[PDB]
Design a binder for this molecule. Structure first.
Ligand SMILES: *[C@@H]1O[C@H](CO)[C@@H](O[C@@H]2O[C@H](CO)[C@@H](O)[C@H](O)[C@H]2NC(C)=O)[C@H](O)[C@H]1NC(C)=O
Ligand SMILES: *[C@@H]1O[C@H](CO)[C@@H](O[C@@H]2O[C@H](CO)[C@@H](O)[C@H](O)[C@H]2NC(C)=O)[C@H](O)[C@H]1NC(C)=O
Lengths: 23, 23
């Protein structure tokens, strides 16, 4: 819908912190 | 770098809630 959007990635602080420990 | 800084602790709401359950 937005003119000029770009691809990138957004960091998720929760996922590594709570997947390394929960493993 | 800051003049007047003090020592203290900052509560982490995530750590107890998600380490007691993940144990
Ligand atoms: C990155 O951006 C490109 C375009 O800027 C996206 O490419 C489109 O992707 C859809 C779905 O895969 C296709 O139907 C279009 O034909 C693609 N267009 C072009 C110009 O390539 C792409 O989806 C974005 N994301 C990624 C991960 O590549
Ligand atoms: C609490 O504050 C004191 C100073 O206000 C800090 O003490 C310094 O600690 C560093 C690293 O351990 C030393 O190199 C300095 O010599 C210490 N200075 C003094 C005046 O003690 C201390 O790091 C802070 N944190 C804790 C947990 O004590």
């Amino acid at each position: 819908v937005v003119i000029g959007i770009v691809n990138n990635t957004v960091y998720d602080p929760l996922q590594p912190e709570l997947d390394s420990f929960k493993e």
